Amino acid sequence: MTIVHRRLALAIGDPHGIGPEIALKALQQLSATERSLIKVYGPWSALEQAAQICQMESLLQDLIHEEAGSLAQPVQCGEITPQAGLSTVQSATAAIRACESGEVDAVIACPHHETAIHRAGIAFSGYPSLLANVLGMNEDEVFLMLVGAGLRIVHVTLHESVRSALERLSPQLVINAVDAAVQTCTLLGVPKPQVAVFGINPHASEGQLFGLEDSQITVPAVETLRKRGLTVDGPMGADMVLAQRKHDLYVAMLHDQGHIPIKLLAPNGASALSIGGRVVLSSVGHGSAMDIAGRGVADATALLRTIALLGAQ
Amino acid sequence: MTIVHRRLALAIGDPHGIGPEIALKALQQLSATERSLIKVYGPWSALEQAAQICQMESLLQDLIHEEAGSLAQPVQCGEITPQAGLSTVQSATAAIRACESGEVDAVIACPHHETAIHRAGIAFSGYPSLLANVLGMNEDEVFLMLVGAGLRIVHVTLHESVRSALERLSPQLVINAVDAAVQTCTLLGVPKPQVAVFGINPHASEGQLFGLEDSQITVPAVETLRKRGLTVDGPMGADMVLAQRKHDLYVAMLHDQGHIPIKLLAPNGASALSIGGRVVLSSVGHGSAMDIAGRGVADATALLRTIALLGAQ
Ligand SMILES: O=C(O)c1cccc(O)c1
Numbered sequence A, B: 001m002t003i004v005h006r007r008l009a010l011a012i013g014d015p016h017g018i019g020p021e022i023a024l025k026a027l028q029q030l031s032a033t034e035r036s037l038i039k040v041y042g043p044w045s046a047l048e049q050a051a052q053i054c055q056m057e058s059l060l061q062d063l064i065h066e067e068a069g070s071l072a073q074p075v076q077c078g079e080i081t082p083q084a085g086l087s088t089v090q091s092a093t094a095a096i097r098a099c100e101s102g103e104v105d106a107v108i109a110c111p112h113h114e115t116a117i118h119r120a121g122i123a124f125s126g127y128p129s130l131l132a133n134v135l136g137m138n139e140d141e142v143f144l145m146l147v148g149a150g151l152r153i154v155h156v157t158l159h160e161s162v163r164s165a166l167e168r169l170s171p172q173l174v175i176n177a178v179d180a181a182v183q184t185c186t187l188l189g190v191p192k193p194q195v196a197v198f199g200i201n202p203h204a205s206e207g208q209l210f211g212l213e214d215s216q217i218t219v220p221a222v223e224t225l226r227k228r229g230l231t232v233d234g235p236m237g238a239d240m241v242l243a244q245r246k247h248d249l250y251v252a253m254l255h256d257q258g259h260i261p262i263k264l265l266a267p268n269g270a271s272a273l274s275i276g277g278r279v280v281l282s283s284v285g286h287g288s289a290m291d292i293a294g295r296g297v298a299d300a301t302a303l304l305r306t307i308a309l310l311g312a313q
C-alpha cells in the first residue's frame, strides 16, 4: 500500500522529544521506494539515539538525510533545553528552505516544545509565523488549513481576538487565503476544487440585515475570484454550507468557525497545514511527549496519517 | 410507550397546512392520560376538517381544547391566505400566554407559513422574536437553545453581527443565558447538568494573550455561577471542549459557535427551543406542506419527537 507519491521533507522536531523516535517508526513502515522520497532534516545524533532505543540501526543506512540543528553535547532524552529548542527551529528552517527551493514538494514537522524554543530566545507563535519569517512574508500573508474527516478549511484570520480579526478582515485578505488554499489543494490531490466561503456574520449577514461586513468583504472577494475563473459559492452561513458537505474547500473567517467542526468530527486526528507561497508545512497532531521520550512507546500513526495526506496524488 | 410527563400547549400552526392533521395524528397515538396533559390551541373548524379527512372524529371528543385564531370562513386546505396567517400567530399567542400564566409548562408550535403571516401585515422573523413581543421582553432577553445528537447549546447572542454581539456581551448576559438554559434542562429531563462555557476568543483568550474579553466576561460569569452552586467548566475554546463530549449543556457566545456543530451532526432531527421567562417554545422541524394539506400524506413523527423532548422526566 503506497502512500508516498512525492518528495517530502521531514524535520524531526525537538531532538529530546519523541520526534526522532516517531520519525524512524513511520519510515520503518514504508517501502524502500517510499523512504527514498522522504528527506530527513535534523541532528544525526538524535536519530542514532532513537535507532538504539527502537532497535532500527539497519534503517539509518538507507535514510536520505541532511544534518540540521546539530547539537553541541549528547542528546538528553526527556529534558527541555534551549539547545534542543534551537535544533527544532533549525531543522524546520532547513526543511522549509528545501521546499522553497523546490527540492521537496511539502514539509512535515515532528513535535516541538515551546518552552524549549522560548528559552533559546526565539520568537515562536506557531508554524504559520515561522513560515513567514523564514520565507520573508508578512504573517498576515500566511494561513492555516485544518484537514480532517473529509473537511478542508483554510482560515483567513487565526490566533487573535475576534474584534482584532474583524478589524483586519478585507477583500484582499480573503482572496489571498483562497489562492493559498487552492494551490494547497493541488498538492492534496484535488486539482480544481469547489470552494465555499463562510459568512463573517450569521446567515452571511442576511444581505445587510445582520451587519454590513459581508457586503464589504466576502461578497466583493467572491465576485473577484469568480471573474478570475474559480468555482466559488458564497458567502453563505457557515452552519448551512458545511452541512451540505459538497465542497472540497471551505473558507472560514474566524478561528472558531473552522476549528469547531474539525475537532468535532475528527477529535483526535486532524492535520494542521501552514500554507505560504509554495510551502505547505504540516505538524503532527500531538506534543513532544517529554515524559516518554527515550522510552520507545510512542505511536507513529499521527505521523503516518500526515505523510499519507501530504503524499497523495 | 409513555412520552408525555407534563402539561403542554400545542398550537396547531397554519390551519390550512398540515399542522391540524399532524396534531390529531400525534394525539391519536398517545394514551388517554397523555392526551389530557396536552391542551390544543387553534380554530376548532380546522380540527374538524382534519378529523373528516383522517377519519378521527371519535378523537375530538377526548381533546382538551381552547378556541384561538378563529376563522371567518371555511378552511381552505392548501391555500395561502392572510386569515390563516393571523390564525397561526393567534394560536401561538394563546398557547404562549397559557405557559406564561402557568396553565401549562411548555409550548409546541406546529408549522406556520411565513408568506401567510406576512400578507396578514404581521412582522414575523422566527419564534424567538414572537415569544419576546408576546411576553413584553427585548429579543436579547430570549435565548435560543439548539438540541440535536446529544448536544444542547444555548446561545447568549444570536441573530446580530459578530461585532454587535461582542459590544453587547456582559457577565450578566451570560449568567442569564445559563440560568434560562439550566431551568430548561430540568424540563428536558436532566435536573443537575454539567455545563461548559465557550470562550469568546480562540482558546478562550489564552489567559489574555488573544484579547481581554474572556477575563472580563466569561471568567467572572463562571465564578458567579459556581458560587450559586452550579457545576460549570470554562471558559474553554469551543473547539476543544465540544470535542470532549462530556457536558449536558454547552453555552455558546455567538450564533455560529453553536449552530455549526448542531447542523453538522443533526442535519435532520434537531429541535430549536426558544426560552424566555418560564416559557419554553419548540417548533416542529418542518414546513406547512401546503401541497399535501388535506391529502393525508403527513406523519406526526417530527411532532411526536418534539413532544417526547419537551415532555421527558
Ligand atoms: O438559523 C437558525 O436560527 C436556525 C435554527 C434552527 C434550525 C435552522 O435550520 C436554523
Ligand SMILES: [Cl-]
Pocket (backbone or CB within 6 Å): B007, B008, B036, B037, B038, B039, B064, B103, B104
Ligand atoms: Cl392542560
Ligand SMILES: [Zn+2]
Pocket (backbone or CB within 6 Å): A159, A255, A259, B202, B203
Ligand atoms: Zn488554535
Ligand SMILES: [Zn+2]
Pocket (backbone or CB within 6 Å): A202, A203, B159, B255, B259
Ligand atoms: Zn440562525
